[PDB]
Symmetry: C3
């Protein structure tokens, strides 16, 4: 049973049958098979067309991931937390990190779930770390010079350096054991507690019309006000936000009504469980037939419609019911499962590209996956800096990467340990490129640790332009290593 890569060394007439036959070209989950798409669906003459279509689909999936994380995942998480009365400053610091890091976390979970894709996770986490500490942080200082806060900066840079070196040693050892994963998660909890304690010590020292409106994602006044490019982006997002509005309930403590849309919410009381059962483990559980007579989805629909009718007749259009926060729980779950589905598709596409072109998991992780997972960071942080909040954006840069690495490695490896019933996760490093990537991350961190205090925490355009030049040269070295020009 040959490897999947062998496909390109066969004759064109046996490619499609090889892909159909070889179990090493089959994916664990997902809905589309991109390799059968390339080698059976598409004429070989039109292979570059298939690949460009794949790239466009990948970019659109990154758009989906960003929108879902920004507008449906974090608001519901914030509703749940505000039900427990936190603080505005910790909220601002940390919820921005959760929102920016949901795609990285779910991509790492999906990649770690399979030994053939596990190198993608390391490539993407370290690659996003390099990109966010050079290009995004430097861009913030180029757009708006400011004076950084010294003590939070030193705290964040120290915690990040520790996490990075821990992962270096786990890579050298070649494995992640259960104790290591629990240690990663514990270190993240310790970091959040330290932030809390330090901040405290410093502080002391008609229904039809509302249905139509609720499902409309366009603000016509704002749309007319915007420029052409903003208009084009809005339309690029319209179908996605329509589906998200249809399926994901949202609870807003900021609004006086808490986004209580009676009929849309009662409809979602049917729709959301169905989407959950149809997207869980790729809907495998959906077609499971109970007792050989009734499938799971039918009984889900029955219970959902009964509960929807009961809620609709036991609630009022003006006043939300006393149990309106359970809707936040449900919307959090549905949004998480949507993000998981999109991440699964992205990982499958990247694996297919690696098979077709014989590219390593590390190089695909550190370029395409990292850039796609950092689009959201770039948008949110550059917007924050342009609005006059560059300290918050700069802090979010270093606070989100800590969450990415610690929670991504710890949770992804823990879930793989538990489901496989094994005792460890194998980290087989693929050549010299992983050590090149590690070296780049370390030296970027060293540059900032020396440079920022030397400027007395007054940051401007020179620091950012130096970081930009560094990232350019890093991509230089990566491409030279991937094509064999630099070999030990």
């Amino acid at each position: 049973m040959a490897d999947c890569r062998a496909v390109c060394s066969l004759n064109t007439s046996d490619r499609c049958d090889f892909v159909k036959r070889n179990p090493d070209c089959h994916s664990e989950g997902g809905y589309l098979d991109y390799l059968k798409g390339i080698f059976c669906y598409f004429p070989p003459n039109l292979l570059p067309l298939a690949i460009t279509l794949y790239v466009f689909w990948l970019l659109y999936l990154f758009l989906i991931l960003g929108v879902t994380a920004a507008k449906f995942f974090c608001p519901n998480l914030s509703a749940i937390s505000t039900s427990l009365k936190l603080s505005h400053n910790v909220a601002g610091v940390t919820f921005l990190a959760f929102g920016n890091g949901a795609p990285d976390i779910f991509s790492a979970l999906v990649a770690f779930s399979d030994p053939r894709t596990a190198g993608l996770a390391i490539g993407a986490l370290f690659g996003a770390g390099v990109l966010v500490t050079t290009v995004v942080a430097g861009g913030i200082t180029i757009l708006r010079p400011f004076m950084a806060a010294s003590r939070p900066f030193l705290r964040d840079i120290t915690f990040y350096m520790v996490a990075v070196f821990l992962t270096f040693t786990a890579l050298y050892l070649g494995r992640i054991t259960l104790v290591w994963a629990l240690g990663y998660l514990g270190l993240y909890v310790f970091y959040v507690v330290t932030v809390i304690i330090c901040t405290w010590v410093y502080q002391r020292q008609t229904t039809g019309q509302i249905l139509l409106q609720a499902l409309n994602p366009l603000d016509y006044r704002k749309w007319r006000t915007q420029s052409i490019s903003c208009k084009l982006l809005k339309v690029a997002k319209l179908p996605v936000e329509f589906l998200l509005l249809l399926t994901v309930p949202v609870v807003d403590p900021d609004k006086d009504d808490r986004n209580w849309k009676r009929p849309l919410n009662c409809l979602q009381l049917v729709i959301s469980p169905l989407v959950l059962v149809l997207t869980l483990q790729s809907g495998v559980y959906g077609i499971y037939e109970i007792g050989g007579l009734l499938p799971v989805w039918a009984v889900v629909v029955i219970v959902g419609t009964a509960l929807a009718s009961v809620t609709f007749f036991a609630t009022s259009n003006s006043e939300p019911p006393r149990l309106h926060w359970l809707f936040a729980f449900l919307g959090f779950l549905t949004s998480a499962l949507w993000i998981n589905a999109a991440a699964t598709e992205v990982v499958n596409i990247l694996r297919s590209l690696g098979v077709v072109f014989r590219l390593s998991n590390t190089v695909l992780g550190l370029t395409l996956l990292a850039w796609g997972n950092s689009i959201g960071d770039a948008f949110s942080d550059f917007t924050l800096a342009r609005q006059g909040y560059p300290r918050m954006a700069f802090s979010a840069c270093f606070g989100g990467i800590i969450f990415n690495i610690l929670v991504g490695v710890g949770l992804g490896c823990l879930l793989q340990i538990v489901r496989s019933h094994a005792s460890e996760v194998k980290l087989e490093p693929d050549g010299l490129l992983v050590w090149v990537l590690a070296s780049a991350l370390g030296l970027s961190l060293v540059f900032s640790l020396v440079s920022v205090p030397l400027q007395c925490f007054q940051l401007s355009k020179a620091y950012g332009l130096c970081l930009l030049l560094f990232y350019i040269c890093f991509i230089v070295v990566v491409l030279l290593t991937e094509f064999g020009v630099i070999h030990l």
Copy 2:
């Protein structure tokens, strides 16, 4: 026959005879044979002295090329164009590009005329591109910070990126066909038309004394005013400007007399045709004897002196004749042929150095030829920036490289196609250094394309210093590649 370079591996006593015998050490054109100079005329103990003398001669030739292009080629071209009503703004943008790019164009023509030297042309064009976009543009921003105009910058950077990638693909294919060369020239014409249209849409939205003076290149008042270094440079140029004044007529629409020097111009009516044929094809046609009795140069002299006498007796000292623009045509032709002769000498010297030291055409093209061809850019653009016109200088930087690459490749390859009666010009790339050079040019362009809009087009010293550091590291990598430290 034996390879020209095998000369060193011989005994000293057979070197001179080997060079005299081997047809692979002979040049197509020129007046001096530098290899016979090294191996026949000088003793083997004084080889480094010969090489230093060669380097000094090469620098002096670059001085000649710069002066001829600046003060005799462009003024006559401008006279011809102003005879047709050119605008002031397009004139300023584009005539500076022609003046800065004449040496690059003629060097590329000469190098493409021979398969042994064709790698020099690619090395010099890409190398000058890297040098002008880093060192010259950065130096402009270091000398005088300014706000760049966004739309012209984006237009220029886009056109340059397209031209560079087109040449990358022609290099990968390994040839330039006739259709490709015509496409290069057509794309340049399209670029000039686009500049015109965009600018328009934006705008709407005694005789003995005069002979003595005309042949004197010194301004005594200015000379006494200048410092020591400027004085030394003027003297370094005096013999060259004397010969240029003697042989090249100049027409100036700025002056009210249009530089009408009656007796000097009537003398030049004899001298200039003689220089043209004697430097045409390195003078081969000059000694062609018509009918076996009268050589070409004698009949040229006869016709020239008859025409000079007729013009002298049919014209007045105070009022130029009504045909004074034909003198601009003649001066344009004579200046072009002088530039061609100097470029031929430079290319022959570089080939001899490559034979003696076993250096590749790419490394000689990207260091010595590129620097020599960019001395004029540095002088003109830094002077413009120091006088308070940094926007014009910065625009000239990116507008001159487009002319260099498109017209140099297109015209040089087209002339070689037509002259050889072949169908294609073979581009045999010499190792890994050409791809190193391509990578440097591309990333430099990427750095500017990201950096300039991110600064909101406000350019200062930090951007320029980063570009300078980049160029230093590029020369690092080039020297490491040439000596084999990085390799496949």
Copy 3:
């Protein structure tokens, strides 16, 4: 007799006996044997603990070297010079260079004294040159922007470039002859004379209480005023300064009493000769027994105590004796011998680390030895810049490296020539790393030579941040070369 690097490839039980037996693992001088410490005294499980202890001891030795040079060597040299009325401006320029460069000079002398350690000297001198011209000079411009003086800068950069290229050619030739060493020292004398002449041409154009106090190194008022880190450093230095106060006499022309401490000085009239005889050449001559009856140290003590009693009874507590400058001579000698002992220990430690880990002399010289020898430069120059004297600090940066290279190579090689009775010092370069280091130094110098005049000598944070990025990338390339990633 196997090369002592093969110690590791043996079984653990024969390591200690191998080290005890092999003469290639024995040092020329010093007091401790670090290899027997690693392989005989400690258990094989605690090797990393031994190495961390060695590193801490090495850092403490660098602290000792810095304190001795700053507070005991230079003050006595200044007393001797001020006895001859030297210029204050020249004093400020040049005495800072002697103080900053004493550790480099003595480390080079010790390393050149043995063929097994001679590569350390070249690595440390060039490495300190790279570090001081990038990190220290850039840090000065980041901490306090200023306008540099053009003529001193151009003079210094020219002299340094000449010295560096001279050493490149000596490395290519593979030796230092006696004429070369004398030429190095003569060129340094020429440089100092040139500085003098240029500056001139520009200018024209109870006893118990006093012993208790004299031996106390703490200033309680200042100590209480300082912060926590300064306090910790003070204690880190207390035992060292106690021993230095005990053994090294100091003469201060600034004080009106010239630091005349009658009883401490009379005690030092005994102590200092004893320390000299106990630390010269590791104490060999100390135990030499004259005539087989009386050792040298006993007769030294007898003469010292007689002379101390005579001086004590022939001098007054209030008025220093007429011969108070001989104490400056004695204190200069004692301080020099203390510095020599500390440098010997540092070199022996570095050789042991190279044996244990199979590291080259070049990489150990350019990282650990260079950083340790430049701690003093960083402290004094950054302190000078923060106090409002960045021109003096920036000048000291380029003036101290000239002293380091010229006097270190010239004097170290001359002393080795004379003592060995040979005619030359062999410079066997160790691989490609030495040429990597040479390339880094040259281009750094080129970057400054172009950049500083282009800014019109107005230096700010952008220039310094570029230099910092360069040094980071240099350490990149060094580590890649040491591990074989780049190679021939």
